[PDB]
Structures are given as C-alpha cells and as structure tokens.
Design a protein around this ligand. Structure first.
Ligand SMILES: Nc1ncnc2c1ncn2[C@@H]1O[C@H](COP(=O)(O)O)[C@@H](O)[C@H]1O
Ligand SMILES: Nc1ncnc2c1ncn2[C@@H]1O[C@H](COP(=O)(O)O)[C@@H](O)[C@H]1O
Ligand SMILES: Nc1ncnc2c1ncn2[C@@H]1O[C@H](COP(=O)(O)O)[C@@H](O)[C@H]1O
Lengths: 529, 529, 529
C-alpha cells in the first residue's frame, strides 16, 4: 500500500493510539480473575500481534473467536483488525449446525475457543475443513492464549492500509433460510465511535457517557461489537470491568465493588437484576443502563426508575452498526413524574448524528410524520453493511430503492420520537435470540397427524416473547400437547433447532381464522388465542 | 456481445443445430408415455425457450430441475443453456437438508420439480428464499410444463455470446463439510462431446458408439450430465429411449422392445438386471453397456460376458467432465478367453484424447509407470472445473501444484492401463452415492456411552461397499447393535443423514488397533474386522 | 506467456502427445527408403526442435518447406508449429515468379528445399532477400536435414502459448492478380482434427476412418495440410505410408505390399491408377479413397465401384480448413445397385459437424433448399481463415455479409445433399491447379493480330478441364493455331505462365456471341464451340 502521509486513513489503530484520553495507570478488570493497567494492555495487544504473525496470519485471513466477555475479547477487538486480518465473531447461542455453517461460510483459518465451549465443537469438529489451529482459552494460568502471548515481544509496527479493508464480520439469524453475514470496515467502525460519542457525550445532564465513567458490558460481546461500546470506552480511557459469564449475583457484586456507572443490557437481564434478593440493599443511584434488546416495557422502566437508575432505550440492529436511535430527555422532561418519565424513556428515541431514518410504505412513498401513520423504517448512515457476504438476491432486497430496509414498522412524532409498532413479518424473538416461525411450522407439520400449524408470538417478561403454536388435528386424531412438545424438542436435541424453542407452548384448536383470500389471520389469531 | 462472425464461439446451440447427422423422422421415446420425432423435439426446445423468456429468465439466471430421465430433462439440457441461463441439476438422492443447502447456495430463480418429489420439497419449502416459481411435472396431460410449452410459438432466435459463459452446475457430496459446486462452460461441454466422440467412435470393432446405435441411459441424469452421453447422442442423431424411474423389468422390456444397443450404468444396476428372472429368455447380444460407477468387479464382468454383452469400464468423476479414461481392447485382446477378457475389461482403462493423467506422490514427484508403484492421479484436460463455486481454500487444494487432484491412488502399466488401488481417504461409497465416515463417527460418538468409534468400508455386490462401524463401549456399558443402529437411523429420519446409512452394520469391539503414533489403523482394522 | 494451468489451450503438441491411441511400435514408412517406429518419430521431432532452436528460430519466425510427401514433411508439420514458429508450405507447381513472390510476401527465414527442386530455386535465388539459410534434402544419407538432426539430443520441453498463435500458412492462386495467403491457428487445426474425426469415425459401416486403418496420402501435402489427414492419422496412431513422388506403378506396389486401406486423391490420379496395366491383377477390396479435387465424375465412380473400392467424394477449399462436406451413405442406400451408388457417391455431400453452409443470392437472401434453385454457398465453421494475409479489400470481399463466400454455385436437396452447379466466375481448373482465363486472354491479346480473345473451359478426363481459347482474327489476318500456341508457350518458358497452359487448344473463329448489353456469352460460347 502506498501511504501518501498527507492522505489520512481512518483505522482502528488510530482509535487505540490516538485516543481522547490515555491514562497509563487506569485499570482493566476481569471479574475476580485479572487486573492490569492500560500500559500492559497496549503491550499485550502488541504481543498478540506478534503471536498472530508467527502463526502465519496474513492480511486477508480470518480469525474466529468463541468465548465470553473478558480482557481477551477486548484484545481481539484490536489486534486482529490492526494486523489487517478479519475478526469473525461467533454467536455461541446458535445451534451447532448453524455454528458449523457459519464457520464454513466465513472460511476461518484459526479458532480461539473457550474451554467450556469445547463440547459444542466436539460434535462438529469432524466437518470443519478450513481451520488449521485451535487455541483453547481458560481462566487460569493454563490458558493457551496466555502462554502464546508470553513468548513474544511487546514491540510491533502496525501496518497502514486502505481504510476500506474489512475489519469484522458476524452472522445474523434474522428470519431466512440460513444465517446471513454482515461486515464492516475500519472506516465504518471509527465513524460509528466518533458519531455516537458526539451524540451521547454532548448531552446536558442525563444519559451521557464521559471520561469519568466506569464501564461494564452486559451484552454478549459477539452481538454486533457489543453495540460498539468497548471501542468507545477505550477511546475515552475509562476503567473497564468485564464480568465473564452473566450471573446476576456476581454482576451485582461487581457493580457494587467496582463502582460501575455505565452499562448496557437487554430487558431480560435488567428484570433478573431487579428481581434478585441481593439487589434490595444496594445503591443503584449512579448507574446508567442503556436498554437496546427489544421494546423496553414501561412497567420495567418504572420499576427501574424507583431505584434511581438512569434507564433509557436505544434502537439498532445487526446490519446497522448497530446504533441508529437513542432517547435523550430535554431538561423540561427531566422534571416529569415517574409515569411520564417511564413513557418517554421506553420509546425507541431520536436518530443519532448522521442518520436519516425515513418512514415509507410498500411503494417507497415517504409517509408523513404525523405521529399515527405507520410504515417501515428505511435508513442511511455512514456505518451500514453494503450487502450480505456471498449473497446477491437478499442483498438486493436489503438495499431496495436506495435505502436500507430495517424490517420494522413504526411511526414518527413531530419532534422526532420513533415508536416501533411491529415487524414486517410474523417472526418471534425469544429473549435476545431470533427464532423463525415458518421453520417451526414446517417441523410441526412433519408430525404424524397435523391439519394446520400456525406459529404466532405472545409477550412475556422473563423472555419478552414466547413462540405460541396453534395446531389443528386431523380427522379422529387426538394427540396431547406433550406429544408435539417432545417432537419439537427432539429436533433441538439433534442440534437442528435453537434452544429458544424449549418454551414453545403449543395449543390445540379446531378452527383457523382466514382472510377473504384465505391467509391465516395471525393478528386476529393473536387476539383470539 | 459483439459477434465478429469470423470469430467462432463453441456453443451448445451449434451442437444441436450443426450435428454430425440429423434425420427429422428419427424418434425420441419416453417409456410407454410419449414418442416424437427430432423435428418436434427442435420445435419443443424453441417453445421452451419462449416460455422461459416469458417467465422473465435473463442471461445470468439459474433454473433448477428435479425429476427423472425423460424427454423434458433432455429439453432442459438444451433450452436453458442456449438462452444463456445456468442449469442447476439437483441430486434427488441427497438428504432434504443438503438439497435445501444446495438450492440456497446456487440461488435458483425457478424450480421444475416432478410430482412425486413434492414431499421432499414440502419439508423444506419454508426455508427457500430465492425461488419465485415452481413448475410441477407429471407424466400425463396434467403436466404444467406441457401446458406452458403449448402456449408458445415454435420460433426463436437463439443469442450468440461468449463461449466461456457458464452452462451447467451441480453439487458433489464428496467428503467435505458441505456439498461443493462444480460448473462447466459451453466450450467445455462442446469439447467433451467432440473429444469423447473421437475417442470411442474411431475404435475398430469393439465398444464403439456410432450413428446406427439406439441409446438408453441408466445413469440418473443429474449426475454430471449423464456422463455427457445425451449430448453425444443428439450430436449423432440416433434414436433415444428414456426409461423414467429405474425398474429392472420395465428396463428389460424397453431394451427388448426398442432394440437398445448402447447404455451406461453402475455395477449395482447391471447386477440387478442380470439377476432378474425376466433376463433369462432375452437376447443380450447387441448391447454395449459402459460401467463407470465404481470398480466393475471381475465376477460381474465374467457373468455379463457369458450373456454376449460388450461390457467395458470407464473412469471419471464430478470435477472432471466427467470422462477421463475408457478401456479399449486391441484386436489381439479380443480373442482371449472369458477370464482374461474379464480381467482386461474391468480395468479403469487408457486415457482419452487430450488427457494427461500423471501419477504423483505427496511431494508432487512423478512416479514411474512401472506397473506396481502407486500414487495419486493428477490430470489436465479441456473440460475440468476451474474451482469450486464460492470457495477459496478447497479450490486451492483442488488445483495444488498446477494439476487437478482426483483423490484416487492407482498404478499405471507400461502400455497405459490404469488400475485404481484405493482412495487418499477413509471414505465409503454405498452404491452410487457418497457417504462420509467422519460424520458417522461423530454421530455415533454423540451416543450415551461410547469410547472409540471408527467407521471403515467393506465390499459388497448389491451395494459395492457397506459402511462398517466399530464401536468400543465404556466401563461397565453394554448396548446392543440394535440400539446404535436405531440411534443412527433417527438422524436419517430427520433429514440429516442420507439413506445410504440404513445398512451401517455396526459391530462392538474392545480393542482398537493403533499405529506407532497412535492413529487408528483402518487398513489393519479392515483386515481384522 | 502466463500459463494458468486450469486454463486449457488447444495446441498441436496436445495433438501429438495426447493422442486417441499411441503404439510405440507402430511404423512410419517412406517408400522403399526408410522405416521407423512412432517412438523414433517422437525423438526425431524433439531433435528437429533442438536443431531449429540452434539455427536461431524464434516464436515469430517463418520456415518454408519445398519437397515431396515423406517423413520429413510429417516432422515439419509438428516441430515447426510446436516451437511457435510458422510453417509456410510452398506450392512447387506454381511458376517460378509466383513462387518467388510468395517467398518474398511471407518473409521466410529458413528454407528446406529438396534436391530436385534446386533448379527452380537457381533461377530466382538472386531476388530472394529475407532468407538466411537453405537446407538441401536428399533421399539418402547425404541429406542435410538428416545430418542436422543427428547432432542434437532427443530431449526438449515444448513451450505453451496462446492457442490463437498462427501455425501454418500457404498461398492460393485462385483467380486474382497475385496469390493470396491464408493462415490457420493451433486452435483451428486441433478443432478441424476433432470435428472431422467425429464426423467420419462415427459412421456405421461405410467410409469410416478408424484405429485399424493404414493411411497413405496421394494429395501433394502442400495443398491445405493434405486435407488435414496426416494430423488425423497421427491422432489415431495408425501406420502411415508416404510414397514420395507420385508414380502410378510404385503407388500400386505400395498399396499392395503395405496393405493400405485409406487414401485421398484427385480424380486424375484415380483415373491413372485404374488405367494402369499393373492394376488389373490387384485386390482393391479394402481401400477407401476420398476424392476431393473437383467434381468426381460418375463414370469414374462407376468404374471404381466395380473394383470393390469404397469411393466417396468430399468438398473443401484452401480458405476453409479445407473440409466442409463429405458424402455419407445411409444403410438403405448401401444396397442400391452400381448406377444409383455412383450417382450418390459423386455428390459433394452433407456438411460436417459444426458447419452451417447456406445458399444465397447476390443480395444475401437465403434461398430455399428445394433441390433445384441455385446460389452461391456461404459458410461458417470453426476453422476458416479470418482474412487474407496483408490484404484489406479482398479480405472484405471474402467475408461480405458476415459469411465466408466460397465462390461456388450449388443447390441443396431436402435431406441436405449439396450439388455444385458451377463457379461464380469464368475460370479454368486444369487437373489440381488453378489457371486464370483473364490472364490468358490478355497474353493472347498481346499478339500481333487479334480482334477478340475469349477463354472458356471444356471438360476432360485426364485433366478434368481444358482451357479452350477462341480468337477472332483482324482484317486480312491469317495465323495458324500453332503460332498462337507457341506464343503462349513462350511466356510459360519464361516462368510467367504456369505449365497447365500447355494444352490450351486455341481455336480460330469469326463471330463472337454477345449479350443484349454486349458481354461475351461464355455459356453460349461453350455450348457453341
Ligand atoms: N430499542 C428497540 N426497540 C424495539 N425493537 C428493537 C430495539 N433494539 C432492537 N430491536 C429489535 O431487535 C432486532 C435486532 O436484531 P438483529 O440486529 O438483526 O440481530 C432489531 O431488528 C429490532 O427489531
Ligand atoms: N471406473 C471407476 N473405477 C473406480 N472408481 C471409480 C470409477 N468411476 C468412478 N469411480 C469413483 O467414483 C467417484 C465419483 O465421485 P464424484 O464424481 O465426485 O461424484 C470417483 O472419484 C471415483 O473414486
Ligand atoms: N468435391 C468437390 N466438388 C466440386 N468442386 C470441388 C470439390 N473440392 C474442390 N472443389 C473445387 O476446387 C476448389 C479448390 O480450390 P482452392 O482450395 O482454393 O485452392 C474449390 O473452390 C472448389 O471449387
């Protein structure tokens, strides 16, 4: 690559080595396991670069990671892209068959896998062709990653290349035949960091991330860069605490003992934290959770506001950076009582800097922002995936009409608040994972005696939504719900179906509502059953 | 495309409309269903081109076909490539999950599916995204293909384009994680036709295909262009008989009633034909079967030679056109008795025109053709797939060292006869389908109590090879063969495993042979169990 | 050249070293002079490559050959193109001035000339500028070619280059001002070999060339690659006999003693062979002459059929590969008596694989194939010369309207038989050489007393056609035919006119038929005189 130093490229190395602030004695904490300053973190990143170079990782290679939220994942967020390689983040919560498919599709060269994820590998390790090396990670001195790092020097000259080289990739299981691969460049990640820092750092007094915070993620960190927050924290040079496996009690202990002030999670985790008996004698009045999983319910928001938690909601998705919207309260709205506060904080929010976010109908006609008309959201931003990896038709359907199609139906108020009414599909979302209703319909239709199977979604608190199934039996056929539940469970036991179908809650009916054309009225069915 | 008429492009339309011979009143026979001359066949091809154009099929589209050997498949072999589209041939004998994977990978626009293959579709139809239209085929006047054709004119001006545009694609399930996609161009298919016609038409008196033959395939016709034979027959303008579903009695009736003289099959089908009671009072002394499935056994060859059948063997594979080698007997060898004849006719044969076929060791060192030294076969020819579709690492391993790696270990005599000794892997091949030993090993290792599972292959006549499994039980564990057989069968019942594992024949042992390094001695195990 | 081994190039080296069959102990016979197997032939080709490289022949050079049909010419057909050089084949039957013109036009670097062609060189050797070396060939151990070969090793690594590099060139004296240069590429020659092998090898029982034949050419071998037959024979690995100079008695002796079964000649040579007294006590019932010079007469065909000779006719020309058409008899026509057989075998035949061959009028309007309407033949094939070397206007007239214009007027039957009625010009063809009527007209018009000279052609058996001249004398002028015959002969004695004018047969007349416009009615004159 011809440098031309006057021509500046936006790279992740500039994010690490040209931060907003850098205190060499600020800490990085891995829960009750490890602690080390920022200077040793930089040294470790350079050592990891040396180790990867020794392993034979070139500028076009892919390194896949499968582990929990820890300092090692933070080191991988930086070392692998800075060498010019591609970081493939594996969703450990997918079924083994889907995990194997994503590994084969991405063509990973090296795999860094945690010890306790080894069983999942053991039932797919035979069918993996591209992988040359496995590095097994442990939480003790026995870790292979740690032994690899300590054989290397803390010196390394990181290359400079084009800012449009791909940095990260991960696979979204949004309803389709197979998982789809998204990817982002160095430029896009740097611009996402800068834009969101501009948006949420400049807020007057509420819901701001600044250089005095202490950050602890509660998002799995293989889900779209942990909403980009680990990159931002490193940019601000703040104390970072990584909990590892999510356990409510140890999480609360970390919050108390480390004085965490900024976190992000999904509604289920927040509900679990609030329902824990250990969370009654704690001081929560310094904490700034951002809820972005799905549809922060107003009841949970009110329950959190009485604990003195600055809870606000945000909107994004796998294809969008992810962050697209955040709720910011004006100083007049900061003095409303708890009910109106809960109503405002549970909206999807206003769009962030450099985002367009129109609302459109099926003919690509921009609807008015009158506050009640609904349509699909279409966006333009500096950090959107241009297409799906190794895909053409779905890529064209993603960017139809010159805009990125989110797949969510919402209405936009006069001031700019966005409220998502539904999806453009009849799909379910159990907790933070995607599950397809059509696939469950087919699996249940493969039963011995089934007339019509239609799967709809019903709301929930510990899960957000449950995949209700409605089955009509054949002539003189009588099978209990246990039979069909076990039949569906058998598929999950083979690694075909994700574990989120373990609470399917099937229901036997005899009449199926159908439209004038005859299509199953899933909205009417939801209002019925 | 700029034509430049002086610049000649090798296209399949030139194969259809510039044949070696064209008799407008020669017949095309679909067994007991339909008969029509070559003139109506040309008219039907033009009508099918018109119908595909009306459906919106452009020059880059893919049309997938899923049916039996019939006149419709022959029409698809010509119409779809001539329009410039790509013909994806679906292997109906793969598991539904593999079929769905191949459909999604190839991104088919239209699917032409037979009526009796509908159930397989019904359990994957939900997870198909790219397909816009299904055409259901039947053997009566109710067929949708027939109704589509009769609404169109018999006039069409076929385009001329570059000869390097892709014509056909199909997926090989040779041992890997997922099926691999091969593809060929118009030029490659035309050159394969011309080269094999030159090789087998110029033979003096034995095993030749000429303009007076009557041709009937017994290869499924979705397996690598039916060895290219339907293209050759059309070039020679000979009578063609298509049997449909392979049933030994109806096949024998067609052979007798239509006076078939040239066919190709795999050893299993030939064994079934010879073992049929209807095949004792028939005159087989005009028939020229080519056996190319795998390792034509000498006993079957002798049994066929006593019926006055000109049986000879050939060698090819999915990546190679397929044809690479054919056995041709010199007039001195035509007077040997039945035993030496059977020995010679069962070899893999000499290479065909324009084929190189060296024998090499693991360091790419060309071994001598002394007749006993063995090595892997590496080939160069005008009709080899340049790589696997949407694949990089396996593509590089396929063409390592500038030659195509077959994966078969053989030795070459002084005169040029090739004899395949084994594979470069421990893989099984039940009848004409590929089955992976490693995947079965993993599935069985997922059992409640298993110590070591190793799968080897043992020979057979009705199947060619059976996938023997050797399982060592855990401490104080005793499970019968029925348990493990049913456990494996359950996976097949879910569409995960191919039906060729229904004769696994597991075996319980307590000692596993291991090398000095410790690897399971699969050859020693085969000699043991 | 960048090889890219997956990208296959069609080269003549692949024709020699990847044949249909290769028997190392098959013979090559040079009549009563030399015999050597195929292994020594390959060694000799490599030695000749080494010698040419030593002489300084690069990839763009031209080597010209002037000798008889022998093993050396066969070696030149392979060695020179395989080195990447261009083989210029000199027509030794042209006048010395025309030979010199072709040598200067082609710009040959080296000339390989036979001893007995030395006198022709001696009267033009002064005016040759480009030539650097002459190699004199003899039929004994004194030959310079033989001495050059034996100083070299039998090892050589032949290059691989683009398949569109020119391989051969030769000059056609079809009626024009000067001879025109045609040329073909490696790809075109390989495709001509494959296509004609497919066409004539797949015939059922009549007129087929197969691997058991013994081949002996009777075409001068500098006339358009000897119709491509030496390349085909080498591909089949058959015994090849080269007679040298054509003498009927030695040719018959070779046929008898070597058991020749396949040959090609022009009608004059066949007539001479049949009229020889030595040809009355011979067994001709194994021989398969192909007659392709011009218009095989039915009387000669009948006379040959009574000797049990499989005589059939073919059609081609210098610009067309040459082969365009061959007569193939269906098994129903094989049982007709001698008269209908003679009628069928004397037609020009049906077109070969990959040939289009329309019939057209002067406005490029495709006439119907009703069997009586006549028009010029226009062709498309994979082995046509794209243009004339170093020529623009004649090149454009050759490919006018997107088709190659043959210059022959024919009609095409319903089944596809082509019958050539005449030429599009008033040109003569004495035996196998072209002679221009306009040039003879001018030469005779240069006489002391001439009013109108018009040259027409009349048929013949020992010559096929004689160049009749009709001369009208001036007022009170009386010169005998001897005077004008000697005047014309004087020009031939100076090397200006070809020797085919030695039987001009001038005729003195007084009235010239003229059309309504006034043009000489050459057809009416032919019916008159
Ligand atoms: N703040 C939110 N409010 C409502 N739905 C949300 C919110 N954040 C995410 N979602 C939903 O969760 C989905 C994320 O799925 P994905 O990123 O594609 O893996 C989005 O497409 C939304 O439908
Ligand atoms: N004539 C033969 N003799 C031995 N093995 C054969 C023969 N024809 C095919 N095979 C085997 O069958 C395989 C075909 O598998 P494929 O074409 O990849 O789908 C080849 O790779 C060979 O291993
Ligand atoms: N089988 C044939 N029947 C009639 N004319 C022929 C036949 N073969 C060649 N010719 C004629 O001989 C000519 C060959 O001249 P050329 O190849 O240009 O040197 C052709 O153009 C035809 O006119």
């Amino acid at each position: 690559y011809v440098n031309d130093p006057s021509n500046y490229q936006l790279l992740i190395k500039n994010l690490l080595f040209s931060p907003v602030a850098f205190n060499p004695e600020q800490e990085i904490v891995y829960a009750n396991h490890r602690r080390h300053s920022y200077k040793t973190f930089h040294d470790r990143v350079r050592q990891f670069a040396n180790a990867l170079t020794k392993m034979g990782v070139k500028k076009g290679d892919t390194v896949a990671v499968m582990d929990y939220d820890s300092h090692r994942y933070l080191e991988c967020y930086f070392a692998i892209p800075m060498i010019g390689a591609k970081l493939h983040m594996i969703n450990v919560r997918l079924s083994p068959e889907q995990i194997l498919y994503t590994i084969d599709h991405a063509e990973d060269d090296i795999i860094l896998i945690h010890e306790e994820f080894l069983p999942i590998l053991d039932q797919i390790k035979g069918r993996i062709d591209t992988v040359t090396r496995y590095v097994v990670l442990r939480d003790d001195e026995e870790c292979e990653y740690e032994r690899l790092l300590e054989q290397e020097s803390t010196e390394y000259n990181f290359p400079d290349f084009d800012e449009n080289t791909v940095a990260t990739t991960f696979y979204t299981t949004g309803t389709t035949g197979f998982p789809k691969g998204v990817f982002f460049t160095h430029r896009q990640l740097v611009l996402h960091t800068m834009g969101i820092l501009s948006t949420i750092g400049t807020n007057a007094s509420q819901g701001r991330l600044h250089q005095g915070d202490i950050y602890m993620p509660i998002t799995p960190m293989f889900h779209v860069h942990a909403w980009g927050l680990p990159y931002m924290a490193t940019m601000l040079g703040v104390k970072q605490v990584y909990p590892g496996k999510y356990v409510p009690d140890v999480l609360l202990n970390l919050i108390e003992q480390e004085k965490v002030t900024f976190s992000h999670c999904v509604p289920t985790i927040l509900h679990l934290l609030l329902s824990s008996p250990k969370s009654k004698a704690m001081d929560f009045s310094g904490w700034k959770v951002v809820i972005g999983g799905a549809a922060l319910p107003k009841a949970l928001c009110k329950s959190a506001l009485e604990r003195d938690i600055d809870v606000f909601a945000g909107y994004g998705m796998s294809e969008t950076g992810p962050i697209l919207s955040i709720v910011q309260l004006t100083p007049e709205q900061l003095e409303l009582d708890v009910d109106q506060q809960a109503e405002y904080r549970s909206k999807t929010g206003k769009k962030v800097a450099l985002v367009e976010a129109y609302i459109v109908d099926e003919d690509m006609n921009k609807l008015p922002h009158d506050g009640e008309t609904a349509g699909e959201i279409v966006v333009r931003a500096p950090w959107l995936t241009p297409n799906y990896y190794k895909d053409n038709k779905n890529s064209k359907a993603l960017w139809r009409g010159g805009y990125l199609h989110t797949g969510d139906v919402a209405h936009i108020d006069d001031e700019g608040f966005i409220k998502i009414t539904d999806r453009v599909k009849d799909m379910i979302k159990i907790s933070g994972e995607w599950v397809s209703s059509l696939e469950l319909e087919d699996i249940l239709h493969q039963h011995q005696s089934v007339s019509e199977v239609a799967v709809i979604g019903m709301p929930h608190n510990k899960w957000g939504e449950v995949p209700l199934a409605l089955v009509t039996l054949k002539e003189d056929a009588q099978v209990t719900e246990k039979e069909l539940l076990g039949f569906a469970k058998d598929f999950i036991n083979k690694g075909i179906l994700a574990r989120e179908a373990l609470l399917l809650k099937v229901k036997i009916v005899d009449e199926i509502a159908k439209t004038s054309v005859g299509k199953v009225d899933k909205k009417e069915l939801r209002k019925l059953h």
